[PDB]
Write a protein that binds this ligand. Structure first.
Ligand SMILES: Nc1ncnc2c1ncn2[C@@H]1O[C@H](C[C@@H](N)CC[C@H](N)C(=O)O)[C@@H](O)[C@H]1O
Length: 213
């Protein structure tokens, strides 16, 4: 009876606060960048790193039917949904949202969220959302927008319903800068976390050497 909501809250706390996983992965990715540089495959790459996590994490719950994460301690949740079921969830079609730099809060037009702050959220949650998307092109679009919304070393929680697909998702997301850091099987669901690596070039290379036709 493990809830995807309880699993997600548990990981986020471990990642930023109680186990400092973000520092463990930083060191792992720094070691990987040195291994690639030592093979002549990569040279000078831009690396952007997070400061010490705040006491209140900025979380974006996309496809948030009812804002399950709003009550969690130390999570400032901004909730979005195409068909909100509760009054605390904002109306929006994520596929049409602009990721804007230079803004602090969502900007609404006609009651629908149309602009969100870039590199502002420590976490973005896609809990059983991507399968509602029609095409694969639009699923990837959701993750590309999440990467622009995340801060350096922020995380994308991806929960999907229930092989070679999960390794193709790892490849396709590593190609946009998101490396998988956790995979767990809960009843009828598969819970994964993807991290905005210190360098996109780094993740793009890991993907190139892990593509299997
Ligand atoms: N293009 C879209 N833009 C915004 N929200 C969407 C879009 N397509 C589906 N949704 C919402 O994503 C939600 C999918 C739900 N199954 C997930 C609800 C909740 N996140 C959960 O973990 O159960 C629905 O409430 C949809 O309204």
């Amino acid at each position: 009876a493990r809830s995807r909501i309880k699993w997600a809250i548990d990981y986020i706390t471990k990642y930023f606060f109680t186990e400092g996983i973000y520092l463990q992965k930083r060191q792992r990715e720094q070691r990987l960048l040195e291994s690639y540089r030592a093979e002549g495959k990569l040279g000078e790459v831009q690396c952007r790193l997070m400061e010490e996590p705040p006491d209140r994490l900025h979380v974006l719950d996309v496809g948030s039917c009812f804002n399950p994460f709003s009550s969690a301690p130390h999570l400032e949740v901004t909730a979005l949904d195409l068909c909100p079921a509760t009054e605390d969830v904002l109306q929006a079609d994520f596929l049409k949202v602009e990721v804007v730099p230079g803004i602090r809060e969502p900007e609404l037009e006609e009651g629908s969220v149309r602009r969100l702050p870039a590199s502002h959220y420590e976490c973005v949650i896609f809990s059983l959302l991507l399968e509602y998307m029609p095409s694969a092109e639009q699923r990837l679009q959701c993750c590309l927008q999440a990467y622009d919304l995340l801060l350096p070393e922020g995380i994308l929680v991806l929960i999907t319903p229930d092989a070679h697909l999960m390794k193709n998702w790892r490849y396709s997301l590593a190609r946009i800068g998101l490396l998988r850091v956790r995979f767990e099987k809960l009843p009828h669901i598969s819970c994964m976390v993807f991290r905005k690596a210190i360098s996109r070039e780094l993740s793009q290379h890991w993907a190139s050497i892990h593509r299997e036709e």
